[PDB]
Amino acid sequence: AVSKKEVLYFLSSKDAESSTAVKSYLKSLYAGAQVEATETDASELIAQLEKKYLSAQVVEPGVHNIALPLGESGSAPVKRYAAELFNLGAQAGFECPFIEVSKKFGQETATSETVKDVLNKTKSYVSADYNAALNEVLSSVEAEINGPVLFDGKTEGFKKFAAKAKAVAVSRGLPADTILAYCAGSANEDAADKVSKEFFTWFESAYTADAAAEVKAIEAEAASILDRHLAKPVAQIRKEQASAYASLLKRAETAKGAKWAEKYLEDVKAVQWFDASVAEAPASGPKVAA
Amino acid sequence: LTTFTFSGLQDAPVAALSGSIKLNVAAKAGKAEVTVAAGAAKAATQVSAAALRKLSGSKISLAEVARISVLHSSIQNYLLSLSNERYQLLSQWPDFTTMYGKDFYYRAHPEDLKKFYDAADEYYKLYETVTEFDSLSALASQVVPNYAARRRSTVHPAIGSTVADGAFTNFLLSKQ
Amino acid sequence: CTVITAEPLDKLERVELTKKAEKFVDAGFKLVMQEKIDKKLLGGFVIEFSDRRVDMSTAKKVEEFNNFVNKLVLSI
Amino acid sequence: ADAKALDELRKPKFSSKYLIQHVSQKLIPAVK
């Protein structure tokens, strides 16, 4: 069954095992059943936790339907990959990723009064190289002021910090002026689209380079795993993979009654069906009843 | 695809491009008579402009029937495309079956002969393990869970360091 | 006492504060709490009884919440 | 038996989705 808040995240979802749950719930509602009340409770901590554990049930099956562009030359397979991750994030309830990590920044340091506490509380959500560069810029400003650089914005200590933070930002390759002019907006649309058409080109280069870095990591990991695996003899490979498959099947046969073990065994039987149905007709593929 | 489409019998492909299948249409004003020639079979129907606009009302929605996942099949396709690049340098190994006869056995130093026979045994080991293609489907399930835990973020699945650096420069260089 | 808050006190909020903080002194005690301000707390209050510290704040609540969740997600 | 469907075969198999569901069905009631 579906517990009336799982169905609300799955309407915009498009993976198959969630789409069949939506269609089963709508077939139940067609034959004279009533829709329950959405719970007018669950204060913001439990609400945000339910968001965190309900959007993962859309992200996780939606990741395994996205083919990595491993070993592809060009810029379009990486852009397809990051576009599919964007559409998965938009179907999972996440916002634009720029807006979401900006909200995480403003949520972590809502009450950090100096720039060192902002730069130490969101150390994780920024790269450690850019954070170390901002630490050295902050100590270069504190060497002149000999006071904590106040996180206020109209203080001259923060302005002398910002005039070097923009410098290290353009030194890191990202245009600070374009991003700042986009996120602060503008009045006329004829000059707002001309900064949108530079911010979104930076943004396309940004997620293209990030998805390409993830693809390069998976390529290097697969090359490491294969170049370790090809050194072994055949019998060691066969017995260690049979042992690992047996242990990971015993982990699912140990748990009984739980939903993930039952779905694990149903998926093993579906894999064996796929192998048998390919064996029944190898030039045509698996049998799909249409 | 969207809900409404705006193509059909207007700025259309008037003719085919390759010789494996020959197509011709009749560019009238109201309707069009098509004819398609692909080898031994010949087909020629007659469709209207109001018959192609009914075509994109039902969406096909192609999807991939994979064994485990489309993700796992992509990683396994990459592992097989790497194993092909290892195979293509085991294809350039010099033939040692042409040096097994006893005019090479007895003209050669015994330790160098043991080293040559061990080199042949090592080639048989390497070629029998690079063609263990049933094991790539179990190798590609070791790259999957770390990757899926990376995309299971609290921020966003598509997020990375460059976007976070740009949003940090925006958040830092604003008022407070 | 010493009542460390996040925002300055309002008239109904203050009497609700001395209603909720009265359940810590174990009689009909008249808490003569002092006011302090602390933007670091994200709401709530902190009573400093000068012998004990009662933490009804929000930052302590979300830290105890995150510790409880990070203690339960490892238990399952 | 054979030739199941299409919408049954488009399910990504060894995704987690259920350990996420086994946590979220035992964390959210235990945290309310």
């Binding site: 498959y245 990971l248 | 921020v155 | - | 060894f14 987690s16 086994h22």
Partner: peptide
């Protein structure tokens, strides 16, 4: 062919941890 199911999140936005290029092509060429 089957993986250990994990139910955990990544909190930080970190580097993708590019591994080192293993030496199979040089060893097999040697």
């Amino acid at each position: 062919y089957l993986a250990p199911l994990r139910s955990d999140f990544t909190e930080e936005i970190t580097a993708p941890k590019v591994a080192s290029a293993s030496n199979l092509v040089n060893e097999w060429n040697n």
